[PDB]
């Protein structure tokens, strides 16, 4: 429940200010950044601050502090979900969102603040429908704005009828220093790119375990979705009954669903690294990278980020296949391999020096994160079975999909 949502910069001056209740004074914003200087430098940083009775809900963009202020017991997730939405809608309008995006385009942005929220109550936040009466270039509001279907306007027409799906895997991994997998879940996310005519109701079916269990095909290949979070447009009451992915999509690119599942099978690529940290002297990383995944599959453009010490110096790299760049700016090495097929196992032998004087303070142990990408490859084994195009006009669309497996949080805790 917002009263005054503000946008600050890295200095703390107001990029744009907008109140919704008047219950928070407009000059309260000048205490936030010193309290932000306070809480951070004592490590008491929270996304909510408090100068007396004014509560400072804020997120942080590249430059920006979307500070939403309130005083009462406001609904908190109501605030921040709107905060990332305003970032999103600005990202929908302004291809980069910085200080240039605000001060040059205050014509539209104040109008967005008038439109997205009244009183602290977000009422219209779908940017695609918002484009139709809030332009930076005014007519009546659309019926889709009035309509319960609030994501897809009628009369959308294309020459072709293309449904572009992107079943994207994101492998999380937590391997400790012991070499055991602590947490390796997979958060996959199907993101749709719809180019369709009119108002279609798309009905999707996958190799769901429960839907195959309801069918009686719970012995064949069936992915087990531990939880999915869907779009609004999915009629979840229809899905709650019988695993039915039925929806009217919006037009264009959108993530429909967000599935999450655990997987007790091996990581696609196992890393073995060593550290010969010689005191005052040097360090050595004889790191290998074996691919456990399928040999037909190839891990594209992998980027193995191994955290090196800060005052590490004189780099030497005995690779096998793939180049190293040493990034002292991140105090690390990126042993990059472009093409790395399954079954392959490439070593890299790193060698730095170390100053004969010690440093003053500790550094801590960041894990190793790599940046693999494997196309045409569902590690969880999810398969889209069909996509029912249902139009009252009636057409034969072109449904299309590609499979891409990337990392989620691919952290492997170092020595």
């Amino acid at each position: 429940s917002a009263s005054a949502v503000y946008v600050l910069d890295l200095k703390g001056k107001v990029l744009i200010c907008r109140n919704y209740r008047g219950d928070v004074d407009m000059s309260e914003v000048e205490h936030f950044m010193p309290i932000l200087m306070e809480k951070e430098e004592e490590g008491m940083l929270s996304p909510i601050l408090a100068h007396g009775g004014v509560r400072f809900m804020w997120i942080k963009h590249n430059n920006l502090y979307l500070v939403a202020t309130s005083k009462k017991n406001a609904c908190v997730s109501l605030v921040f979900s709107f905060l990332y939405k305003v970032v999103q809608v600005f990202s929908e309008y302004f291809k980069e969102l910085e200080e240039e995006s605000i001060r040059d385009n205050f014509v539209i942005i104040y109008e967005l603040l008038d439109e997205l929220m009244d009183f602290g109550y977000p009422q219209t936040t779908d940017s695609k429908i918002l484009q139709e009466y809030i332009t930076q270039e005014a007519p009546r509001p659309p019926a889709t704005v009035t309509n319960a279907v609030s994501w897809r306007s009628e009369g959308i027409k294309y020459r072709k009828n293309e449904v572009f799906l992107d079943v994207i895997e994101a492998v999380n991994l937590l391997v400790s220093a012991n070499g055991n997998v602590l947490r390796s879940e997979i958060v996959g996310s199907i993101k749709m790119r719809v180019f369709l005519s009119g108002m279609p109701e798309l009905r999707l079916g996958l190799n769901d375990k429960v839907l195959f269990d309801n069918t009686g095909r719970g012995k064949s290949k069936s992915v087990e979705l531990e939880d999915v979070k869907f779009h609004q447009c999915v009629r979840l009451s229809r899905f709650e009954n019988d695993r039915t992915i039925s929806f009217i999509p919006p037009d264009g690119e959108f993530e429909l669903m967000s599935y999450r599942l655990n997987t007790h099978v091996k990581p696609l690529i196992w890393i073995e690294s060593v550290i010969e940290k010689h005191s005052h002297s040097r360090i050595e990383y004889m790191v290998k990278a074996k691919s456990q995944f399928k040999r037909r599959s190839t891990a594209n453009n992998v980027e193995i980020h191994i955290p090196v010490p800060n005052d590490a110096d004189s780099p030497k790299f005995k690779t096998t296949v793939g180049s190293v760049k040493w990034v002292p700016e991140n105090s690390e090495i990126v042993w990059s391999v472009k093409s790395f097929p399954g079954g392959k196992e490439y070593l890299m032998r790193a060698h730095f020096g170390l100053p004969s004087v010690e440093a003053e303070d500790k550094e801590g142990k960041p894990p190793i994160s790599v940046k693999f990408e494997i196309p045409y490859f569902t590690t969880s084994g999810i398969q889209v079975r069909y996509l029912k195009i249902i139009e009252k006009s009636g057409y034969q669309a072109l449904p299309w999909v590609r499979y891409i497996t990337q990392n989620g949080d691919y952290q492997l805790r170092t020595q």
Binding site: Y376, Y386, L387, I389, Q396, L398, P399, W400, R402
Partner: peptide, 13 residues
């Protein structure tokens, strides 16, 4: 998008 697409069925009756 340098990767290419693959067409699914429509009905799967």
């Amino acid at each position: 998008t340098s990767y290419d697409y693959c067409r699914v069925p429509m009905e799967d009756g």
